[PDB]
Design an enzyme around this catalytic site. Structure first.
Site, PDB file in Angstrom:
ATOM      1  N   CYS A 164       2.835  -7.541   5.427  1.00  0.00           N
ATOM      2  CA  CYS A 164       2.495  -8.221   4.180  1.00  0.00           C
ATOM      3  C   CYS A 164       3.679  -9.037   3.663  1.00  0.00           C
ATOM      4  O   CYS A 164       3.553 -10.229   3.353  1.00  0.00           O
ATOM      5  CB  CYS A 164       2.053  -7.226   3.095  1.00  0.00           C
ATOM      6  SG  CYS A 164       0.608  -6.218   3.416  1.00  0.00           S
TER       7      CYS A 164
ATOM      8  N   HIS B 223       1.895  -5.641  26.499  1.00  0.00           N
ATOM      9  CA  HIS B 223       1.064  -5.661  27.702  1.00  0.00           C
ATOM     10  C   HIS B 223       1.887  -5.685  28.988  1.00  0.00           C
ATOM     11  O   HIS B 223       1.555  -4.974  29.949  1.00  0.00           O
ATOM     12  CB  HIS B 223       0.172  -6.897  27.580  1.00  0.00           C
ATOM     13  CG  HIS B 223      -0.653  -7.219  28.788  1.00  0.00           C
ATOM     14  ND1 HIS B 223      -1.823  -6.552  29.088  1.00  0.00           N
ATOM     15  CD2 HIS B 223      -0.504  -8.174  29.739  1.00  0.00           C
ATOM     16  CE1 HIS B 223      -2.346  -7.074  30.187  1.00  0.00           C
ATOM     17  NE2 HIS B 223      -1.566  -8.061  30.598  1.00  0.00           N
TER      18      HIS B 223
ATOM     19  N   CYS C 275       4.715   1.348   3.975  1.00  0.00           N
ATOM     20  CA  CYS C 275       6.030   1.045   4.508  1.00  0.00           C
ATOM     21  C   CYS C 275       7.093   2.029   3.977  1.00  0.00           C
ATOM     22  O   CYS C 275       8.090   2.297   4.668  1.00  0.00           O
ATOM     23  CB  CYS C 275       6.335  -0.448   4.263  1.00  0.00           C
ATOM     24  SG  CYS C 275       5.269  -1.671   5.164  1.00  0.00           S
TER      25      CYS C 275
ATOM     26  N   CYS D  89      -8.150   0.146  31.519  1.00  0.00           N
ATOM     27  CA  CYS D  89      -7.516  -0.719  30.532  1.00  0.00           C
ATOM     28  C   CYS D  89      -8.447  -0.888  29.333  1.00  0.00           C
ATOM     29  O   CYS D  89      -9.675  -0.817  29.458  1.00  0.00           O
ATOM     30  CB  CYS D  89      -7.184  -2.063  31.192  1.00  0.00           C
ATOM     31  SG  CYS D  89      -6.804  -3.481  30.099  1.00  0.00           S
TER      32      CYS D  89
ATOM     33  N   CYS E  30      -4.478  -1.493  20.665  1.00  0.00           N
ATOM     34  CA  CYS E  30      -3.526  -2.217  19.822  1.00  0.00           C
ATOM     35  C   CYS E  30      -4.264  -3.294  19.034  1.00  0.00           C
ATOM     36  O   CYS E  30      -5.107  -4.013  19.580  1.00  0.00           O
ATOM     37  CB  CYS E  30      -2.430  -2.853  20.686  1.00  0.00           C
ATOM     38  SG  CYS E  30      -1.185  -3.896  19.817  1.00  0.00           S
TER      39      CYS E  30
ATOM     40  N   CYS F  74       6.355  -0.305  21.040  1.00  0.00           N
ATOM     41  CA  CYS F  74       5.518   0.880  20.864  1.00  0.00           C
ATOM     42  C   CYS F  74       5.229   1.592  22.177  1.00  0.00           C
ATOM     43  O   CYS F  74       5.034   2.808  22.178  1.00  0.00           O
ATOM     44  CB  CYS F  74       4.197   0.465  20.201  1.00  0.00           C
ATOM     45  SG  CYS F  74       4.437  -0.335  18.631  1.00  0.00           S
TER      46      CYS F  74
ATOM     47  N   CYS G 291       0.807  -1.212   0.000  1.00  0.00           N
ATOM     48  CA  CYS G 291       0.000   0.000   0.000  1.00  0.00           C
ATOM     49  C   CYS G 291       0.849   1.276   0.000  1.00  0.00           C
ATOM     50  O   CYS G 291       0.288   2.377   0.046  1.00  0.00           O
ATOM     51  CB  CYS G 291      -0.990   0.004   1.193  1.00  0.00           C
ATOM     52  SG  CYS G 291      -0.302   0.540   2.789  1.00  0.00           S
TER      53      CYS G 291
ATOM     54  N   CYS H 299      -0.445  -5.498  15.036  1.00  0.00           N
ATOM     55  CA  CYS H 299      -0.106  -5.384  13.613  1.00  0.00           C
ATOM     56  C   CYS H 299       1.244  -5.992  13.233  1.00  0.00           C
ATOM     57  O   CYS H 299       1.470  -6.205  12.037  1.00  0.00           O
ATOM     58  CB  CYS H 299      -0.189  -3.926  13.147  1.00  0.00           C
ATOM     59  SG  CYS H 299       1.192  -2.847  13.663  1.00  0.00           S
TER      60      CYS H 299
ATOM     61  N   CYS I  49      -0.932   3.591  19.841  1.00  0.00           N
ATOM     62  CA  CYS I  49      -2.243   3.001  19.566  1.00  0.00           C
ATOM     63  C   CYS I  49      -3.020   2.732  20.843  1.00  0.00           C
ATOM     64  O   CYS I  49      -4.241   2.921  20.879  1.00  0.00           O
ATOM     65  CB  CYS I  49      -2.078   1.707  18.777  1.00  0.00           C
ATOM     66  SG  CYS I  49      -1.112   1.922  17.276  1.00  0.00           S
TER      67      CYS I  49
ATOM     68  N   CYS J 204      -8.187  -4.504  22.866  1.00  0.00           N
ATOM     69  CA  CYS J 204      -6.730  -4.396  22.833  1.00  0.00           C
ATOM     70  C   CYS J 204      -6.052  -5.764  22.769  1.00  0.00           C
ATOM     71  O   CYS J 204      -6.298  -6.635  23.605  1.00  0.00           O
ATOM     72  CB  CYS J 204      -6.260  -3.652  24.068  1.00  0.00           C
ATOM     73  SG  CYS J 204      -4.444  -3.297  24.063  1.00  0.00           S
TER      74      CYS J 204
ATOM     75  N   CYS K  75       2.254  -2.871  10.463  1.00  0.00           N
ATOM     76  CA  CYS K  75       1.355  -2.468   9.383  1.00  0.00           C
ATOM     77  C   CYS K  75       0.900  -1.027   9.671  1.00  0.00           C
ATOM     78  O   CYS K  75      -0.241  -0.773  10.096  1.00  0.00           O
ATOM     79  CB  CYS K  75       0.180  -3.447   9.250  1.00  0.00           C
ATOM     80  SG  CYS K  75      -0.829  -3.225   7.762  1.00  0.00           S
TER      81      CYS K  75
ATOM     82  N   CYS L 128       2.910  -2.220  29.736  1.00  0.00           N
ATOM     83  CA  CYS L 128       1.913  -1.209  29.425  1.00  0.00           C
ATOM     84  C   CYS L 128       1.616  -0.340  30.649  1.00  0.00           C
ATOM     85  O   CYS L 128       1.483  -0.863  31.764  1.00  0.00           O
ATOM     86  CB  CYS L 128       0.607  -1.877  28.987  1.00  0.00           C
ATOM     87  SG  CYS L 128      -0.697  -0.696  28.553  1.00  0.00           S
TER      88      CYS L 128
HETATM   89  S1  SF4 Z   1      -4.466  -1.475  27.596  1.00  0.00           S
HETATM   90 FE1  SF4 Z   1      -3.940  -3.361  26.323  1.00  0.00          FE
HETATM   91  S2  SF4 Z   1      -1.693  -3.718  26.617  1.00  0.00           S
HETATM   92 FE2  SF4 Z   1      -2.392  -2.207  28.240  1.00  0.00          FE
HETATM   93  S3  SF4 Z   1      -2.859  -3.439  30.109  1.00  0.00           S
HETATM   94 FE3  SF4 Z   1      -4.811  -3.257  28.964  1.00  0.00          FE
HETATM   95  S4  SF4 Z   1      -4.901  -5.072  27.514  1.00  0.00           S
HETATM   96 FE4  SF4 Z   1      -2.739  -4.872  28.295  1.00  0.00          FE
HETATM   97  S1  SF4 Z   2      -1.171  -1.898  16.556  1.00  0.00           S
HETATM   98 FE1  SF4 Z   2       0.043  -2.534  18.431  1.00  0.00          FE
HETATM   99  S2  SF4 Z   2       1.980  -3.352  17.552  1.00  0.00           S
HETATM  100 FE2  SF4 Z   2       0.981  -2.180  15.855  1.00  0.00          FE
HETATM  101  S3  SF4 Z   2       1.902  -0.097  16.039  1.00  0.00           S
HETATM  102 FE3  SF4 Z   2       0.022  -0.050  17.273  1.00  0.00          FE
HETATM  103  S4  SF4 Z   2       0.681  -0.567  19.431  1.00  0.00           S
HETATM  104 FE4  SF4 Z   2       2.385  -1.145  18.033  1.00  0.00          FE
END
Ligand code: SF4
Ligand code: SF4
Ligand code: FCO
Ligand SMILES: [Fe+2]
Ligand code: NI
Ligand SMILES: [S]
Lengths: 483, 283
Positions: free
Chosen positions: B121, B208, B21, B232, B265, B247, B18, B268, B259, B238, B159, B211
């Site tokens: 991809c 996680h 990248c 959360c 999240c 990330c 796409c 990806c 994200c 997520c 991605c 996180c």
């Molecule tokens: S927001 Fe997502 S990565 Fe963060 S504690 Fe909750 S489930 Fe885990």
């Molecule tokens: S979707 Fe998850 S792994 Fe992909 S860039 Fe966002 S936080 Fe990082």
């Protein structure tokens, strides 16, 4: 007087995606053209069977340059299908996310894709080698300004993506637009951060980008005299300015055969005679659309379908939107039109149909539209309310349909979704570069860029630079065209 | 780097991609993309940004490939579709012959120093290989293996990937090659890849477990709307628990967001993206 030469260009470079162009040249001019989109993925079949909410992530991967456009069309279609009532502040937040990528995309297009058509880069890859007679006319000083601005624009376009990500999560591929609105309420602090970046982008657009397009254009005045094609345009509306669905920054309309007409989406049909799809799927409106690949079908030459509006072949993009809406020109455009071209103009249509619908006119329209977007974004920064909710959380319907209409940076975009048993039953996409870069329809009428190539000068068959120069003026994105 | 330093040749081939990248790489902060292009690599072929076009661009790549046989880096962006004799992705035409992505990878793959599969991809198949697809979209490593091509592959998924993962993997490889030569250097790179071919400096930690909302997860305090940034995001969909990326720390787009803060999240960078991470908006 010379006879025929047939020239194939694959890949066409300094566009997005996979495009082959084949032109017939006779006596120094293009007399026929065929455009081939050479890569297919099939998003419309991949999406079937999924939770409808997944579409607003999946569809963005049609294109990494314009993912916010597909995000927007998808969430608008889902909003309609789900009956989600987006909060006012979420409508504005969406406009801030998406408007920042118009700035990114137009700057990327002019500097990083188009400017090498007129500017010699430094003596190293990817700026060399190139055609030995590339028709690069700028003085040493103005060429150097183009290179310096190309380099500066790499920073500016990156800053635009920071703007997108502030409320969009990341870019490419935002997380922040969903059915029901936007996922993150703007805070006072992040609105300061967006505005500070926006000021830098504004200054670059006003002081460097808009002036350079007119100035380079004034050294290529012949490029306003070619590339007219059908002189026919489409706008479907974009950037809602209230919650009624009736008022938009760009209002819808069609222009063809010298006449303004309303836009009625029921008049869209997609033809496939010259496209690699099953013959029985020809001529369908998107609400009944089908995507059945046929890569071996005789006579076809592209994975792009051929959309027609009441039988008409139309173009889309900044020229289309600016011609349909006829806004006032920027102060610096008014001044440089007078100083460098001897033209007195107040509104966009004062350029006249011939010069507007031209190779260089499409670059001018894109620069003018970038300036126009600055005022829209400034208005949204005054209108947004820090801290006010931006999303509702709607239940997924068992059975529903919806259509989202917007304008991607390259032109009109719609997504249609039909939900059955709480899953995607059909999803159909009719995109911007689809309207521009499509092949002939079932009646043999050329696509917009195919037709705009007719008459393009090729005075040197060994350096046929104007073929791809014309194509680049339309800012093709073949990932979008084919999906 | 310097304008006058040694910069290895790179060819960037797009299959079923796409362009995201390429765009993500343009967003690199440190080094800037200008410094990458002018001081780090020599980007000899790239359809989105290079000066020349058509058969001339293809032949330029072929001339460089002959001069630097065994030594150029080949970046692949997008999957490689094998159905219909490769016809779902044509990347060029020379000598009146169309060149499919299949053809191109069979031509240049054997002669690269290494293949960098950039994006999910290319690394794993991604969206073009997902349920409902019909093009035979294939990951780079599988395509090369199926065709007897032994050239080392490094996966840099996402991605899109973060620019720092792409530039940083290039820097990792160039550092190793400076210290050990090409074969010794690539051997040191392979030693720091996980079982999915991903460099552990960027993909060796779980989202996680690192996180900032992990305390809320453990307490069972879950946001019921996206705009509640205290709880959360697990109930909103997520996929952090199943995702290996950094990330949470480097964040995105100059550190301005990421994200999980913004929404959820979607996993990806993982080999099963998208289907194994879907539906995106429920657990
Ligand atoms: S927001 Fe997502 S990565 Fe963060 S504690 Fe909750 S489930 Fe885990
Ligand atoms: S979707 Fe998850 S792994 Fe992909 S860039 Fe966002 S936080 Fe990082
Ligand atoms: N802009 C953009 Fe992409 C295209 N063409 C879409 O829609
Ligand atoms: Fe479509
Ligand atoms: Ni696009
Ligand atoms: S976009």
């Amino acid at each position: 007087a010379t006879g025929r030469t047939t020239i194939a260009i694959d890949p066409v470079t300094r566009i997005e995606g996979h495009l082959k162009a084949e032109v017939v040249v006779e006596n120094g001019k293009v007399v026929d053209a065929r455009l081939s989109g050479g890569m297919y993925r099939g998003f419309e079949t991949i999406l079937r069977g999924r939770d409808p909410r997944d579409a607003s992530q999946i569809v963005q991967r049609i294109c990494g340059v314009c993912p916010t456009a597909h995000s927007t069309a998808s969430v608008l279609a889902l909003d309609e299908a789900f009956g989600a009532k987006v909060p006012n502040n979420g409508r504005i937040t969406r406009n801030l996310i998406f408007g920042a990528n118009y700035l990114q995309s137009h700057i990327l297009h002019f500097y990083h894709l188009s400017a090498q058509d007129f500017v010699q880069g430094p003596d190293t890859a990817p700026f060399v080698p190139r055609f030995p007679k590339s028709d690069l006319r700028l003085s040493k000083e103005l060429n150097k300004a183009g290179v310096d601005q190309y380099i500066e624009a790499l920073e500016v376009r990156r800053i635009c993506h920071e703007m997108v990500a502030l409320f969009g999560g990341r870019m490419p591929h935002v997380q922040g637009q969903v059915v029901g609105g936007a996922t993150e309420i703007p805070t006072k602090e992040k609105l300061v951060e967006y505005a500070a970046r926006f000021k830098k982008v504004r200054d670059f657009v006003e002081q460097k980008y808009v002036p350079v397009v007119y100035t380079i254009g004034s050294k290529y005045k012949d490029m306003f005299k070619v590339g007219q094609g059908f002189k026919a345009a489409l706008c479907v509306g974009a950037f809602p300015l209230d919650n009624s669905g009736k008022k938009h920054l760009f209002m819808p309309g069609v222009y063809a055969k010298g006449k303004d007409m309303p836009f009625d989406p029921s008049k869209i049909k997609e033809y496939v005679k010259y496209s690699w799809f099953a013959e029985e799927t020809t001529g369908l409106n998107y609400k009944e659309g089908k995507t059945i690949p046929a890569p071996d079908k005789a006579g076809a030459y592209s994975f792009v379908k051929a959309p027609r509006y009441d039988g008409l072949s139309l173009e889309v993009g900044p020229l289309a939107r600016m011609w349909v809406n006829n806004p006032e020109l920027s102060p610096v455009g008014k001044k440089l039109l007078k100083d460098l071209f001897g033209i007195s103009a107040k509104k966009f249509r004062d350029l006249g149909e011939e010069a507007a619908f031209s190779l260089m006119g499409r670059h001018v329209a894109r620069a003018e539209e970038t300036y126009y977007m600055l005022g829209a974004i400034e208005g949204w920064l005054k209108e947004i309310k820090a801290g006010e909710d931006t999303v509702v959380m709607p239940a997924v319907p068992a059975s529903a349909e919806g259509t989202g209409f917007t304008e991607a940076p390259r032109g009109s975009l719609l997504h249609y979704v039909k939900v059955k048993d709480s899953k995607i039953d059909n999803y159909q996409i009719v995109s911007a570069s689809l309207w521009n870069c499509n092949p002939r329809d079932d009646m043999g009428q050329r696509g917009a860029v195919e037709e705009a190539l007719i008459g393009i000068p090729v005075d040197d068959i060994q350096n046929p630079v104007n073929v791809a120069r014309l194509i680049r003026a339309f800012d093709p994105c073949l990932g979008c065209a084919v999906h | 780097g310097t304008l006058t330093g040694e910069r290895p040749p790179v060819f960037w081939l797009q299959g079923q991609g796409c362009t995201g990248c390429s765009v993500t790489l343009l967003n690199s902060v440190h080094p800037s993309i200008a410094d990458v292009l002018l001081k780090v690599i020599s980007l000899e072929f790239h359809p989105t940004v290079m000066a020349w076009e058509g058969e001339h661009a293809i032949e330029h790549m072929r001339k460089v490939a002959e001069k630097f046989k065994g030594k150029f880096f080949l970046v692949i962006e997008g999957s490689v579709p094998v159905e219909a004799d490769g016809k779902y992705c044509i990347i060029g035409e020379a000598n009146h012959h169309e060149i499919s992505m299949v053809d191109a990878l069979k031509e240049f793959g054997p002669n690269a120093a290494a293949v960098l599969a950039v994006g999910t991809c290319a690394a794993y198949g991604g969206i073009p290989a997902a349920e409902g697809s019909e093009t035979g979209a294939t990951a780079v490593s599988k395509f090369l293996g199926d065709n007897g091509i032994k050239t080392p592959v490094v996966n840099i998924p996402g991605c899109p990937p973060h620019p720092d993962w792409i530039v940083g993997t290039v820097v990792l490889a160039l550092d190793a090659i400076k210290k050990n030569g090409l074969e010794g250097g690539l051997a040191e790179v392979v030693k720091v890849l996980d079982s999915d071919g991903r460099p552990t400096p960027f993909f060796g930690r779980n989202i996680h477990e690192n996180c900032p909302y992990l305390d809320k997860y453990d307490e069972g305090v879950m946001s019921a709307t996206f705009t509640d940034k205290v709880g959360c995001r697990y109930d909103l969909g997520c996929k952090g628990p199943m995702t290996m990326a950094d990330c949470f720390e480097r964040k995105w787009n100059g550190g301005v967001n990421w994200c999980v803060q913004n929404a959820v999240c979607i996993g990806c960078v993982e080999p099963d993206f998208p289907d194994g991470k879907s539906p995106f908006y429920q657990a």
